[PDB]
DNA sequence: ACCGCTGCAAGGAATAGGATACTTGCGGGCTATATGGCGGCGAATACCC
């Protein structure tokens, strides 16, 4: 299990950069503006989603 | 009971990389000052009576 939280103050490299060493690990990000991208990314299915308002 | 040595602090530069804004390089897409040709003719001045 990894907890990225705040991840919108790392980038793409330092966000998959343990994720190449344990390919299956599993990726829980905490964050409450993300950065366009992952945002993005999470809207079009690619990751799930979770909004606590 | 004096002295050279060791060790525990002090003293900070250069990069990565996510920010923030500057600086400009450019390209498409606009606006805005002569000196080697004559010949003919009719009209416009000049003039000196």
Same mark, same amino acid.
């Given at each position: !299990? !990894?907890?990225? =939280?705040?991840?919108?103050?790392? $980038?793409?490299?330092? @966000?998959?950069?343990? @994720? +190449?060493?344990? +390919? &299956?690990? =599993?990726?829980?990000t905490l964050? +409450?503006? *993300?950065? *366009?991208?992952? !945002? &993005?990314?999470?809207?079009? $299915?690619?990751? =799930?989603l979770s909004?606590? +308002?």
């Amino acid at each position: !299990l !990894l907890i990225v =939280d705040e991840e919108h103050r790392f $980038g793409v490299r330092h @966000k998959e950069r343990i @994720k +190449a060493m344990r +390919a &299956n690990v =599993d990726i829980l990000t905490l964050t +409450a503006t *993300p950065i *366009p991208r992952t !945002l &993005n990314m999470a809207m079009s $299915g690619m990751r =799930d989603l979770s909004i606590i +308002a």
